[PDB]
Design a protein around this ligand. Structure first.
Ligand code: BCL
Ligand code: BCL
Ligand SMILES: CC[C@H]1c2cc3[nH]c4c(c3C)C(=O)[C@H](C(=O)OC)c4c3nc(cc4[nH]c(cc(n2)[C@@H]1C)c(C(C)=O)c4C)[C@@H](C)[C@@H]3CCC(=O)OC/C=C(\C)CCC[C@H](C)CCC[C@H](C)CCCC(C)C
Ligand SMILES: CC[C@H]1c2cc3[nH]c4c(c3C)C(=O)[C@H](C(=O)OC)c4c3nc(cc4[nH]c(cc(n2)[C@@H]1C)c(C(C)=O)c4C)[C@@H](C)[C@@H]3CCC(=O)OC/C=C(\C)CCC[C@H](C)CCC[C@H](C)CCCC(C)C
Ligand SMILES: COC1=C(OC)C(=O)C(C/C=C(\C)CC/C=C(\C)CC/C=C(\C)CC/C=C(\C)CC/C=C(\C)CC/C=C(\C)CC/C=C(\C)CC/C=C(\C)CC/C=C(\C)CCC=C(C)C)=C(C)C1=O
Ligand SMILES: CCCCCCCCCCCCCCCC(=O)OC[C@H](CO[C@H]1O[C@H](CS(=O)(=O)O)[C@@H](O)[C@H](O)[C@H]1O)OC(=O)CCCCCCCCCCCCCCC
Ligand SMILES: COC(C)(C)CCC/C(C)=C/C=C/C(C)=C/C=C/C(C)=C/C=C/C=C(C)/C=C/C=C(\C)CC/C=C(\C)CCC=C(C)C
Ligand SMILES: COC(C)(C)CCC/C(C)=C/C=C/C(C)=C/C=C/C(C)=C/C=C/C=C(C)/C=C/C=C(\C)CC/C=C(\C)CCC=C(C)C
Ligand SMILES: COC(C)(C)CCC/C(C)=C/C=C/C(C)=C/C=C/C(C)=C/C=C/C=C(C)/C=C/C=C(\C)CC/C=C(\C)CCC=C(C)C
Ligand SMILES: COC(C)(C)CCC/C(C)=C/C=C/C(C)=C/C=C/C(C)=C/C=C/C=C(C)/C=C/C=C(\C)CC/C=C(\C)CCC=C(C)C
Ligand SMILES: COC(C)(C)CCC/C(C)=C/C=C/C(C)=C/C=C/C(C)=C/C=C/C=C(C)/C=C/C=C(\C)CC/C=C(\C)CCC=C(C)C
Ligand SMILES: COC(C)(C)CCC/C(C)=C/C=C/C(C)=C/C=C/C(C)=C/C=C\C=C(C)\C=C\C=C(/C)CC/C=C(\C)CCC=C(C)C
Ligand SMILES: [Fe+3]
Lengths: 281, 43, 307, 55, 49, 55, 43, 55, 43, 55, 42, 55, 42, 55, 51, 42, 37
């Protein structure tokens, strides 16, 4: 079934691979070459998770957990029951996520819109591949990757973090957090401001973007504008994920100690290292 | 003459009521303070 | 490679723009500030004007006094030495009262009295900023969505500094004012309560915090992708749906099988962000008052393996 | 002092009554909070000893 | 084709490394490099033809 | 001093009365909190000792 | 006649009541200080 | 010196009077807090020892 | 005139009220300093 | 030495006056803080010894 | 000149500014004398 | 030597005098801080020894 | 001429700039002589 | 060697003179900092021994 | 090879050459200073018994 | 050319610049000699 | 222009030669001062 305006857009073409072989829809969903690829990897990865639950011997979905190979397996293959399923599901996850981005590129072409959405999604893929692929390969073992399990992947976050003391002291982790909090602030404000104009006080006319500019200037003396706010929300989200990936690729590869000890480089700058008093004197 | 657009007489009416509300409030306030002082002095 | 509309190619500058009047008390609005050519590459160039008025002055003065009270404590902890002040800037901390003082206001100025004084100025500054955020919308006849969204952040902040200390029975439970010390507090809080990852409302709060980065990435990329059709002019797309709004809707419908509208995506946006600190505040309010070990609570509720 | 009323041509009663209503409530709660936080004046806790309801 | 701003950024990232090594060696601490190399290169970057 | 009244010819009277009200409130609370934070002047803890209340 | 639009007379009217209020507030404060000094000298 | 008043042709005295007021108050508050931090000049402690108000 | 819009006549009177505030404030500050000095010299 | 006044044909006195005002204050405060942190020049700790207030 | 001031105005302006500076310098010079008498740094 | 004044036909003296003001001040700050860092030249620490002012 | 300063404006403005430079640099030399008399570095 | 004047037809003199000024400052400061970094040429510490200023 | 001044704007070419050639020359001096055998400042300290 | 300078302006500006280079380098040469008298680095 | 590129290339080459000469002195001088082969 179609949206009432949809029909005029369902034209042929824009496909990157396969021409018209897969240029059709299935309900609302566009298929295409990479939609076939996407569904295969998604279904295989999901089904191998359910099979891993059988091998693990639980059906509670919150206890199901697919662990990577132990560190003794290095970057080589492991037995399926003992890390090899995780490796195949990681291939399927990568295949599904990449196919999904490429399917979005095809939909962008058919609608004639910019490629910003699949490009933004590629940042999430690179953060995933940092944690499951690039950093484990740098550190030399698949066992430094996180396990696929709702709560057990939080054990990996905890155990990885506390290996370096309080992980709040990672300076790139601090920058990533600052973008994450600022993004959530901006999304609250942007949602509220647009809604407050479209949904004014009862009986009043819809407000204009002039009122939107006016409210924020009255509130804080500045207004980024309709175009600026969507640039900002995109770049804040992408910066958060860039500095997140950066904070981990350095952790356990060029920095090994307690992250709190890094900040002594500032304290021990020689023009003030020895000056008595304060906290460090 | 003024910012609010009250008249000078509307100001006097409202003020006479406001002050009476204040005096009724503070009258109870004194009785409460004196009662607590008699019960348990703080000085 | 083509133009991506991430930075502007040409800046134009007209006259200064004074903004809508409605019921704004225009005596309380300043002059317009200078233009910034740097900001003009990414958004608007104009700074100002700003509205002050009564809740403005109250909020700015109390907020100044909060900031000044912390600063003087840091200058004292530096021993007035301007070099030590810059060396140890992130290590200074205005700590709350010690536990033996409970909730009593009797703690010495160096043992927590200045933290209560600082916290009082913060209380007045933040709450008067909330009323200011409500009244600036009222003067323009706008909806109060921004004030009700800000109330969700105040809820977490009130839980951290006020409500949970009262329910726990000491100001020692509150957050210290300091860069590394509020980080040490955050880490210590999780250790005392037995791994906060197993708090389900901390789990939810993270889901909405990740979802806010997910959703603003999706929405920001969507509007830039359709900006070639004037899709950033979202209110006129709400009033008079153009091809921008239809192409945006069909991208997501064809991708994931369902879609928003130009008005309705901003409801997803506000709730995704509001739920971060709403569920967060609940998760902290339960910590120590109802659950003192979240990992063991997780074991009894089928989310961690039993011993 | 006889012209203290002249304030109402300056300030709107709707603004003043709300602002004062919020102020007085928070001042009252602040003082009851201060006293309940003080063991020498917690009236519920004083009664627990006076009537030996404790233990 | 490389824009004037692109060429500027490409070349600014060189000055950053170069002035940084110069002053990290001269000032005896890598932070002096990072500060001076940052200021000089950012000044160069900000001013394209 | 005879021309201090010309303050009202240059400053809006509402902004002055608000700004001065705000100031006096914050100052008064700050001093009472300084005295509560001072062991020799906390009137509640003084009277608690004076009358052998729990302190 | 000034920035505020108040006249030279309105400015004297309001100043007369402002000082009436200031002197009352400070008189009560002076009494409060003297009572506390008699109770517990800080010098 | 006699021409110093021509400063009010250069600066809007509303902005100067606001800026000056907060400057003076912050400066005075800082000096009093410096002296309270200074044990030899904390008048609240000096009187406490003079009158044996602690112990 | 100048940059504000005050005249010579306006500015020269305003300044006299400003300086009346300055010296009054300064005179009290002198009395405060001398009283504190007599009580507790800082040199 | 006579022609220096032409500098005011180059810079707006408002900007220069504010800039030198902030400069002088921030410089003066910095120096007094260097002295208060210098034990040989902290006048508060000097007079404390000179009058045996340290006890 | 890019302040728009006439020369007459700049001469007037400079006379007030320098008289302020002479007054400020005078107080500073006395202050350094008093501190040097109180506690020489050389 | 005679033509160096043509620099003012190239650089607008407003920008030059600001940049020069920053440059010269920060250079003076460098040198005084290097001297305060230097035991043989820290004038406050030298004066302390010369007048026995420490311990 | 990038700044629009006429040759006479540049020949004037330079003369006042130099006057300030010589005054400033002179005072610096007096300061160096005094501090050399206090504590020769060479 | 005569035609070296052609450089000014290609490079704007402002944007060269700025580049030269920054360059010469950096080169000079780098050398002075290297010299202070060697005891062989640290003119402050050569002087400290020569005049026996730290003993 | 004089075509190259048509192929690339000589403004860019001299900006490249001038900075790179300086940073190469600097790099060469700064590595030599890190040696024991050719640091001229610290060799001269030995010849004249300065340290 | 990119700057629009005449042959007059390019040769004039160069002659002033070269007098700057010579004067700066001449004082630098003297500064080296002054230190070489005190402490030769070879 | 094609003729302007002839002119500039000559000028740049003449300078590029003039710089080379100074290094051809300076390595000889430092070979004299402390030979490195
Ligand atoms: C043991 C080691 C020896 C020694 C061995 C050597 C040897 C061997 C050589 C040098 C060379 C040089 N050494 Mg060494 N050197 C020693 C110690 C020193 C010391 C010091 C503090 O002790 C210094 C300052 C120098 C300095 C120098 C330079 C004069 C020269 C490199 C210039 C260069 O490449 O510029 C950078 C080059 C460029 C092309 C870029 C020019 C500048 C750019 C463009 C920046 C902007 C300029 C500005 C805008 C002006 C524009 C002009 C326009 C036309 C208008 N030496 C000791 C004694 N030195 C080299 C030489 O002679 O080179 C010719 C060389 O081969
Ligand atoms: C060792 C550390 C612990 C831990 C301990 C805690 C604790 C403790 C808390 C959180 C909380 C949060 N944690 Mg956790 N957390 C850990 C691991 C994580 C990880 C991870 C990948 O491992 C993530 C993504 C998170 C994520 C998050 C967020 C979802 C949540 C904060 C939401 C928010 O918006 O706060 C930021 C927003 C605010 C604080 C609101 C501020 C509003 C006020 C009004 C602003 C006033 C401004 C002031 C006046 C200044 C004005 C300046 C202007 C210029 C004028 N945690 C581990 C397990 N986490 C919080 C929570 O809600 O928990 C359920 C919380 O309290
Ligand atoms: C880069 C900025 C943020 C971002 C952006 C972003 N994400 C995006 C997009 C964009 C712009 C999309 O276009 C795309 C989309 O379609 O959104 C609806 C997407 C998307 N972001 C998603 C989720 C997501 N994004 C996240 C984060 C972020 N996304 C960043 C913060 C997170 C977390 C944890 O932070 C999650 C969970 C999806 C809703 C969607 C991508 C959907 C997709 O890939 O579909 C194809 C695959 C499947 C349907 C299923 C695959 C199944 C696997 C083969 C098996 C499971 C393996 C997995 C590793 C198990 C993990 C277990 C966990 C408990 C650990
Ligand atoms: C829903 C959850 C998210 C949320 C929402 C949110 N926050 C909000 C809002 C919303 C919807 C607002 O409407 C409100 C706002 O106004 O935003 C612009 C706000 C806001 N969120 C803020 C911060 C913030 N939000 C955060 C987080 C979140 N905000 C969540 C992610 C965080 C963190 C740590 O994650 C922070 C730090 C503020 C920007 C603002 C509230 C401002 C406020 O209350 O300020 C009080 C203080 C002052 C008014 C002044 C302080 C002192 C200044 C230096 C002024 C001094 C002036 C003085 C006159 C100077 C004199 C000097 C003399 C020497 C001369
Ligand atoms: C300005 O405004 C804008 C809007 O709008 C105008 C918007 O909307 C939005 C969008 C945002 C919202 C609506 C807000 C809500 C969204 C979020 C908060 C983000 C989170 C979103 C989700 C959690 C949803 C994610 C959904 C996913 C991942 C997809 C789930 C569905 C599948 C797994 C199926 C996908 C289908 C594919 C790939 C093709 C399927 C078909 C084939 C592979 C072909 C084979 C099948 C056939 C040939 C025939 C049919 C056979 C079938 C069906 C079965 C057998 C098939 C086999 C292969 C065996 C934004 C941003 C916006 O900016
Ligand atoms: C016509 C074509 C002709 C081709 C000729 C043949 C070419 C074969 C060589 C290929 C060269 C490149 C191989 C990679 C680098 C290398 O040498 O690695 C060799 C190491 C072995 O290291 C071992 O040694 C490591 C040390 S070391 O590197 O030797 O020093 C050690 O750290 C590690 O533990 C140990 O296992 O192994 C790897 O790095 C693993 C490769 C993994 C590829 C599959 C991934 C599947 C797991 C899940 C992740 C899925 C990701 C999906 C992404 C889409
Ligand atoms: C840490 O430092 C310490 C705290 C220890 C020391 C700080 C020292 C310091 C810097 C103190 C500064 C003090 C100053 C500057 C005090 C100034 C006080 C003044 C000017 C007070 C004036 C008060 C006037 C009042 C209260 C009254 C005015 C009344 C008027 C105008 C009449 C109209 C009003 C009404 C009819 C009232 C209507 C009712 C309500 C509820 C508004
Ligand atoms: C912390 O310090 C170290 C230990 C590191 C040592 C080194 C510190 C250091 C480098 C110090 C340097 C200090 C310098 C550079 C000080 C410079 C001070 C200056 C520039 C002071 C100037 C003062 C000027 C004053 C006070 C002028 C006042 C003018 C007045 C009052 C009048 C203004 C004019 C008018 C009103 C104009 C009226 C006329 C018309 C036509 C409108
Ligand atoms: C412990 O010490 C530290 C470590 C913190 C070191 C501190 C050292 C330091 C740098 C201190 C600096 C202190 C300074 C710079 C203080 C300056 C104070 C000044 C500028 C005070 C001025 C006061 C002026 C007053 C009180 C004027 C009041 C004027 C009034 C009330 C009237 C205003 C005029 C009118 C209403 C105009 C009416 C007429 C018409 C026509 C509208
Ligand atoms: C430890 O050793 C170190 C690391 C510190 C070694 C550092 C080595 C090093 C690189 C030092 C560099 C020092 C330099 C480059 C110093 C340069 C100083 C200069 C050029 C100073 C110039 C001062 C000029 C002054 C004070 C001029 C004042 C002008 C005045 C007052 C007049 C203003 C008025 C007019 C021009 C009138 C306007 C005319 C019209 C027609 C409107
Ligand atoms: C081991 O230690 C090190 C690493 C430092 C070893 C050495 C490393 C190394 C590779 C050093 C290289 C040093 C070099 C490349 C030095 C080059 C110095 C230069 C380029 C000096 C040039 C000086 C030029 C001056 C001062 C020019 C001044 C010009 C003036 C004042 C006049 C400008 C013209 C006008 C105002 C006229 C305007 C005309 C019109 C028509 C408006
Ligand atoms: C340059 O030097 C100057 C002195 C001029 C400025 C120096 C400025 C400076 C260095 C400022 C430093 C500020 C810092 C580092 C601030 C850090 C703040 C942080 C990280 C705060 C984090 C969390 C705070 C929270 C959650 C606070 C909550 C507070 C609440 C909810 C208020 C509750 C109220 C009370 C407990 C008071 C109750 C009292 C009464 C009277 C009822
Ligand atoms: Fe939007």
């Amino acid at each position: 079934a179609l949206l009432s305006f949809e029909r005029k857009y369902r034209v042929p073409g824009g496909t990157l691979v396969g021409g018209n072989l897969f240029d059709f829809w299935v309900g609302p969903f566009y298929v295409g070459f990479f939609g076939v690829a996407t569904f295969f990897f998604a279904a295989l990865g999901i089904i191998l998770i359910a099979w891993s639950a059988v091998l693990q011997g639980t059906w509670n979905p919150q206890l199901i957990s697919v662990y990577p190979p132990a560190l003794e397996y290095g970057l080589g293959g492991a037995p399926l029951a003992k890390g090899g399923l995780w490796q195949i599901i990681t291939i399927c996850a990568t295949g599904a996520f990449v196919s999904w981005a490429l399917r979005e590129v095809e939909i962008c072409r058919k609608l004639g819109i910019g490629y910003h959405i699949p490009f933004a999604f590629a940042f999430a893929i690179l953060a995933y591949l940092t944690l499951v692929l690039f950093r484990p390969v740098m550190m030399g073992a698949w066992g430094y990757a996180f396990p696929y399990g709702i709560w057990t992947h939080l054990d990996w976050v905890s155990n990885t973090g506390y290996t370096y003391g309080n992980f709040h002291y990672n300076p790139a982790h601090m920058i990533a957090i600052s973008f994450f909090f600022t993004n959530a602030l901006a999304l609250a404000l942007h949602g509220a401001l647009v809604l407050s104009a479209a949904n004014p006080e009862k009986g009043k006319e819809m407000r204009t973007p002039d009122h939107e500019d006016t409210f924020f200037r009255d509130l804080v003396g500045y207004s980024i504008g309709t175009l600026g706010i969507h640039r900002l929300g995109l770049l804040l989200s992408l910066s958060a994920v860039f500095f997140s990936a950066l904070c981990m690729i350095i952790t356990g590869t060029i920095w090994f100690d307690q992250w709190v000890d890094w900040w002594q480089w500032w304290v021990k700058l020689p023009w003030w290292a020895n000056i008595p008093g304060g906290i460090n004197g | 003459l003024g910012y609010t657009g009250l008249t000078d007489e509307q100001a006097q009416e409202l003020h006479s009521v406001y002050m009476s509300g204040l005096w009724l409030f503070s009258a109870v306030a004194i009785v409460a303070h004196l009662a607590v002082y008699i019960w348990r002095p703080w000085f | 490679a083509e133009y991506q509309n991430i930075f502007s190619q040409v800046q134009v500058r007209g006259p200064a723009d004074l903004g809508m009047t409605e019921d704004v008390n225009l005596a309380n609005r300043s002059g317009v500030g200078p233009f910034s050519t740097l900001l003009g590459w990414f958004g608007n160039a104009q700074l100002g004007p700003i509205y002050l008025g009564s809740l403005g002055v109250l909020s700015l003065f109390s907020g100044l006094m909060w900031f000044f009270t912390i600063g003087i404590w840091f200058w004292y902890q530096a021993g007035w030495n301007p070099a030590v002040f810059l060396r140890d800037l992130f290590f200074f901390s205005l700590e709350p009262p010690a536990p033996e003082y409970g909730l009593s206001f009797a703690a010495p100025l160096k043992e927590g009295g200045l933290w209560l004084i600082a916290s009082f100025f913060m209380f007045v500054a933040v709450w008067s900023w909330w009323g200011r955020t409500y009244l600036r919308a009222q003067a323009l006849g706008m909806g109060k969505h921004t004030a009700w969204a800000f109330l969700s952040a105040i809820w977490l902040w009130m839980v951290l500094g006020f409500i949970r200390p009262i329910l726990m029975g000491s100001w020692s439970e509150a957050v210290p004012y300091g860069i590394f010390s509020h980080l040490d507090w955050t880490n210590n809080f999780s250790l005392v309560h037995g791994n906060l990852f197993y708090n389900p409302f901390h789990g939810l709060s993270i889901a909405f915090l990740y979802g806010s980065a997910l959703l603003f990435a999706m929405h920001g990329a969507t509007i830039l992708a359709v900006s070639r059709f004037g899709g950033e002019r979202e209110l006129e797309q709400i009033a008079d749906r153009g091809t921008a709004a239809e192409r945006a809707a069909l991208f997501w419908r064809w991708t994931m099988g369902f879609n928003a509208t130009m008005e309705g995506i901003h409801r997803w946006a506000i709730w995704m962000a509001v739920l971060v600190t709403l569920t967060g505040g609940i998760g902290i309010l339960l910590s120590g008052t109802v659950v003192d070990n979240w990992y063991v609570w997780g074991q009894n509720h089928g989310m961690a393996p039993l011993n | 002092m006889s012209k203290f009323y002249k304030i109402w041509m300056i300030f709107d009663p709707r603004r003043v009554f709300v602002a004062q209503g919020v102020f007085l409530f928070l001042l009252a709660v602040m003082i009851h909070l201060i006293l309940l936080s003080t063991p020498s004046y917690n009236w519920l806790e004083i009664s627990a000893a006076k009537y030996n309801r404790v233990a | 084709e490389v824009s004037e701003f692109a060429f500027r950024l490409m070349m600014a990232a060189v000055i950053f490394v170069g002035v940084g090594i110069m002053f990290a060696f001269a000032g005896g601490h890598w932070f002096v490099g990072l500060v001076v190399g940052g200021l000089v290169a950012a000044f160069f970057a900000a001013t394209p033809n």
